[PDB]
A = this chain, B = another copy of it.
Amino acid sequence: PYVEIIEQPKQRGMRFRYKCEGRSAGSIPGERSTDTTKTHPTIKINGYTGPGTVRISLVTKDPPHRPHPHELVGKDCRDGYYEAEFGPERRPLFFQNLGIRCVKKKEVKEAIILRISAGINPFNVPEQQLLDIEDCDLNVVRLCFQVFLPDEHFTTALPPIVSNPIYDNRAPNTAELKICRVNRNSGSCLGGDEIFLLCDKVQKEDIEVYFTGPGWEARGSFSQADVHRQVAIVFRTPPYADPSLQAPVRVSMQLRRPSDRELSEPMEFQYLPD
């Protein structure tokens, strides 16, 4: 048989906690989790019922999928990975109290060496590239689910599968984009209105303010000098498609990161006839 991910983890939102912040790094959310009810990364073993073992490991975002320096902590976790005892019942396979613990940049080598020492290299990658020579990333991880089926004395290894990449909300370039507050949400259809936009930490060299409407797009209009300490952007509204507005049109304004073409939740802006 094989393994399948039913509820992928959420990708943007949570901070990778360090070891010094102690305890557990909370618990990775389900992709569709909300305040009404919270979902958790959950899997099912297609075409099988019975006992077994599930082991979860952090792996790189990119194809070779090396084991990742960061490590999981929480329920049923030890030595930096998850390895729990599977029960026939299942409803299906929930993983709530998983938590991503990031390691200091200096402890990266000793961590990878610690991982492959325990024989965790799910995709048996050649050694010359696993020990690395380049970067790594450290802001993006992927869950790796390894399922072992009965034979113990749980050794029948199903194919290991990866989740969607998970992004550190604390890193400026992989963080979730968020408009916190604006001085005003309406302006002349001619544009040129100065807007003070308060947001979560961005990088001045990598941020734009993207206005859109049905078959229309326009950018902010500012310089890097206009990005105050990563959390305020002072820009001027762009001209709208129709400079002769007779009634207000509702457009959608949002922060956009060119690097990964990511977008904040839209904020309603209203072009006025002027």
Residues of A within 8 A of B (CB): 180-181, 183, 194, 196, 198, 201, 228-229, 231-232, 234
Q: How many copies does the complex hold?
A: 2
Alpha-carbon gap, A228 to B183, bound state (A): 13
Alpha-carbon gap, A228 to B198, bound state (A): 7
Alpha-carbon gap, A270 to B181, bound state (A): 25
* Shortest distance from the beta carbon of A79 to any chain B beta carbon, whole Å: 29
Query: CB-CB < 8 A to A183: which residues of B?
Result: 183, 194, 196
Query: CB-CB < 8 A to A198: which residues of B?
Result: 196, 228-229, 232, 234
Alpha-carbon gap, A198 to B225, bound state (A): 13
The 4 closest A-B pairs by CB, nearest first: A196-B196, A229-B231, A198-B228, A183-B196
* Shortest distance from the beta carbon of A22 to any chain B beta carbon, whole Å: 17
* Shortest distance from the beta carbon of A93 to any chain B beta carbon, whole Å: 40
Alpha-carbon gap, A174 to B76, bound state (A): 46
Query: CB-CB < 8 A to A196: which residues of B?
Result: 183, 196, 198
Residue in B180, B181, B228, B231 whose beta carbon sits within 8 Å of that of A181 in the complex: B228
Alpha-carbon gap, A229 to B201, bound state (A): 9
Alpha-carbon gap, A234 to B194, bound state (A): 16
* Shortest distance from the beta carbon of A212 to any chain B beta carbon, whole Å: 24
Alpha-carbon gap, A181 to B234, bound state (A): 10
Name A229's closest neighbour in chain B (CB-CB).
Answer: B231
A-B contact pairs, 14 of them (CB 8 A): A180-B228, A181-B228, A181-B234, A183-B183, A183-B196, A198-B228, A198-B229, A198-B232, A198-B234, A228-B231, A228-B232, A229-B231, A231-B231, A231-B232
